[PDB]
Amino acid sequence: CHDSLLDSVGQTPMVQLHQLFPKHEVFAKLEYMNPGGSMKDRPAKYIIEHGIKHGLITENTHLIESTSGNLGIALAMIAKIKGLKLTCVVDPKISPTNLKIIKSYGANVEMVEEPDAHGGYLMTRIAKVQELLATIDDAYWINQFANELNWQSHYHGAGTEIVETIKQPIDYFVAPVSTTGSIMGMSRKIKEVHPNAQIVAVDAKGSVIFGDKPINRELPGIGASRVPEILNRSEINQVIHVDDYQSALGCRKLIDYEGIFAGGSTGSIIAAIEQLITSIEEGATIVTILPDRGDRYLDLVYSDTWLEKMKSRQGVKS
Amino acid sequence: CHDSLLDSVGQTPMVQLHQLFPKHEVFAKLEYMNPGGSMKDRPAKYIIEHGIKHGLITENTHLIESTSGNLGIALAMIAKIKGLKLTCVVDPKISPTNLKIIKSYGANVEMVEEPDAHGGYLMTRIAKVQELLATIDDAYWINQFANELNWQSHYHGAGTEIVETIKQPIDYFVAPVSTTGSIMGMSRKIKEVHPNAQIVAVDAKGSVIFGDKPINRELPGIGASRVPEILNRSEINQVIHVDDYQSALGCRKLIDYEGIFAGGSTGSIIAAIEQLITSIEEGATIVTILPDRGDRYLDLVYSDTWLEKMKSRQGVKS
Ligand SMILES: *Cc1c(COP(=O)(O)O)cnc(C)c1O
Ligand SMILES: *Cc1c(COP(=O)(O)O)cnc(C)c1O
Numbered sequence: 001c002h003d004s005l006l007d008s009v010g011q012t013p014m015v016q017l018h019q020l021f022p023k024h025e026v027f028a029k030l031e032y033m034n035p036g037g038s039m040k041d042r043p044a045k046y047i048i049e050h051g052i053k054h055g056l057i058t059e060n061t062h063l064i065e066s067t068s069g070n071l072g073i074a075l076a077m078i079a080k081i082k083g084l085k086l087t088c089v090v091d092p093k094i095s096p097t098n099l100k101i102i103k104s105y106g107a108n109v110e111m112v113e114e115p116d117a118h119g120g121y122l123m124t125r126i127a128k129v130q131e132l133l134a135t136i137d138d139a140y141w142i143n144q145f146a147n148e149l150n151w152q153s154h155y156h157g158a159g160t161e162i163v164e165t166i167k168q169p170i171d172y173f174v175a176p177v178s179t180t181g182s183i184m185g186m187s188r189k190i191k192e193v194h195p196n197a198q199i200v201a202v203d204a205k206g207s208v209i210f211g212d213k214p215i216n217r218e219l220p221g222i223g224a225s226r227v228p229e230i231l232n233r234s235e236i237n238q239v240i241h242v243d244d245y246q247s248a249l250g251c252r253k254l255i256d257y258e259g260i261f262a263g264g265s266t267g268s269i270i271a272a273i274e275q276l277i278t279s280i281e282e283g284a285t286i287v288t289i290l291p292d293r294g295d296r297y298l299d300l301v302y303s304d305t306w307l308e309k310m311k312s313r314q315g316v317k318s
Numbered sequence: 319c320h321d322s323l324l325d326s327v328g329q330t331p332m333v334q335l336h337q338l339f340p341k342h343e344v345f346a347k348l349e350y351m352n353p354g355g356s357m358k359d360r361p362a363k364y365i366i367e368h369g370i371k372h373g374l375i376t377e378n379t380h381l382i383e384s385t386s387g388n389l390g391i392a393l394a395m396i397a398k399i400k401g402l403k404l405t406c407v408v409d410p411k412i413s414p415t416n417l418k419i420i421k422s423y424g425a426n427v428e429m430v431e432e433p434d435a436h437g438g439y440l441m442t443r444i445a446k447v448q449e450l451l452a453t454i455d456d457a458y459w460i461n462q463f464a465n466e467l468n469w470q471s472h473y474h475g476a477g478t479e480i481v482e483t484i485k486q487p488i489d490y491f492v493a494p495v496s497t498t499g500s501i502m503g504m505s506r507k508i509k510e511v512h513p514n515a516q517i518v519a520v521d522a523k524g525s526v527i528f529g530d531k532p533i534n535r536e537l538p539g540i541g542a543s544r545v546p547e548i549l550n551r552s553e554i555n556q557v558i559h560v561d562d563y564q565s566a567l568g569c570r571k572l573i574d575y576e577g578i579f580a581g582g583s584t585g586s587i588i589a590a591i592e593q594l595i596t597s598i599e600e601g602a603t604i605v606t607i608l609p610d611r612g613d614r615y616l617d618l619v620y621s622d623t624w625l626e627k628m629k630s631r632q633g634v635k636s
């Protein structure tokens with residue numbers, strides 16, 4: 001019996017993917033089963049509650065972040081529960097579904113209209129966040145790419161739950177990246193108990209997080225157009241890049257073999273573990289996380305016509 | 319640690335709605351936090367597993383049901399996990415989102431095209447189900463309106479969990495209806511422990527389940543165009559009808575006061591409990607269920623333009 005929905009954040013299920021990985025012990029943490037629908041419930045709850053506890057955030061404090069995705073939805077839920085104003089800075093590319101969910105939770109949306117000269121809205125949204133911090137008195141910037149509380153939420157969140165459940169040695173921990181909060185915080189907790197666990201980052205082809213050559217990327221959730229301040233690269237032992245097509249095939253294989261309907265970055269994870277398995281020992285124990293549901297990828301991954309277009313994008317292999 | 323996603327069906331959270339109901343003890347069972355996204359995980363899992371256990375369903379058995387909604391999605395998930403073929407009979411009114419989710423799980427869809435003479439597809443889908451049962455050898459009809467396993471799943475499911483958690487006397491149990499499996503099965507279990515609990519059905523205005531005058535109804539999930547065989551009316555102590563507008567206001571109030579983003583029939587439940595509270599004792603203990611998420615109601619309940627249209631439909635009150 002809970003007093004709030006907040007009490008059901010965390011303690012997410014762990015499954016073994018027996019059918020998909022018959023020659024390894026692969027455990028998936030179902031972070032998408034958080035009450036808000038994604039893993040971002042963890043940093044949204046943790047960051048806001050920490051700020052309230054330490055007097056940085058009061059009922060009068062206006063929360064700000066540039067996000068069009070899962071973190072915007074999570075922040076909107078937590079802000080509504082706590083009685084806090086929230087403004088999400090977004091751009092015209094936001095999916096109508098996410099926009100409507102964020103607005104349904106009563107958050108404000110500040111949509112930038114001016115692309116930079118070469119078509120992106122990235123620098124425009126960075127600037128808009130600073131404008132709001134200049135003009136809205138009593139504000140708190142979630143600051144997802146630099147806030148230590150992001151990775152700390154994952155250290156105390158799924159990272160702690162993983163090492164309590166998977167007490168046998170963890171040979172590989174595999175996570176997708178955007179802010180790198182998840183892989184930093186979870187790997188830090190895992191390696192306290194399993195110091196020899198290898199930490200494998202999965203990124204989108206074209207993401208600049210690990211210096212890849214930028215290409216047009218369709219899938220949200222995985223990859224970034226900046227190097228996050230949160231990232232400490234010496235803590236990453238292997239980096240696997242996956243393209244949109246590969247990722248989508250991974251999602252479709254996971255639902256076919258296991259009946260788990262997960263989002264794009266989970267497909268990236270599946271593709272990456274299939275690559276990893278060609279080099280590692282049979283029987284290895286691999287832990288990963290499934291951040292969100294397939295539901296908002298119906299016109300991406302789960303669309304056959306989109307899939308065919310992504311197949312055509314594989315450069316020379318197309 | 320689970321071997322399958324199926325192990326995470328059930329044991330859903332119970333919250334208290336302190337803010338929405340400050341003068342009563344109102345407990346909500348979050349059935350939408352089942353892994354498939356709605357309460358229909360319970361009958362889908364229970365019915366299929368029972369059939370397999372008793373030799374009515376084997377790997378060669380083709381599952382059939384007429385459903386465009388939550389039960390189709392749940393059946394598709396369970397069928398995929400179990401390795402079973404599924405055909406959902408639907409009509410042109412199916413939402414594109416639900417259609418895409420059911421197809422993503424690998425289920426077959428049989429969409430009827432011929433309305434009857436007065437515009438509905440109800441009799442056409444009833445006939446299509448019998449045609450498939452005539453022409454597909456080795457089939458099993460889920461038969462949601464008449465299958466005893468539907469209400470049994472809820473007796474063993476949330477009903478059992480409710481009486482284990484809420485050991486204090488339950489004064490009112492409030493549930494929405496379509497097949498009446500939920501209210502029948504859950505009330506039967508509740509009244510073993512709390513024989514004086516009053517059982518309150520919440521239906522859509524215009525639904526024929528309790529003999530209301532049919533009107534055009536927008537919201538899916540609640541109400542039916544037949545009297546379910548499953549229903550035993552002597553077990554229902556009070557019936558509250560709610561219209562589309564009322565239900566939508568209930569959803570919007572629940573998310574505003576509690577940060578819970580739930581679907582149409584949850585709004586019906588909220589509207590009905592607000593009515594109930596005008597007659598019952600202050601401080602009463604009320605238990606209810608929240609069957610699904612707000613996510614597929616973004617162009618219904620959570621659309622301001624749709625809400626205004628429903629406001630205009632309230633007959634003389636408009
Ligand atoms: C947040 C997110 C990630 C990446 O997590 P970070 O902690 O930001 O590195 C991957 N997939 C999805 C769907 C996400 O929401
Ligand atoms: C199934 C369903 C109901 C009604 O439940 P029954 O057991 O069929 O009476 C109400 N709301 C939603 C969203 C449902 O999926």
Ligand SMILES: [Mg+2]
Pocket residue numbers: 137138
């Ligand atoms: Mg002010």
Ligand SMILES: [Mg+2]
Pocket residue numbers: 223224225226
């Ligand atoms: Mg970026």
Ligand SMILES: [Mg+2]
Pocket residue numbers: 455456
């Ligand atoms: Mg045959």
Ligand SMILES: [Mg+2]
Pocket residue numbers: 541542543544
């Ligand atoms: Mg009907």
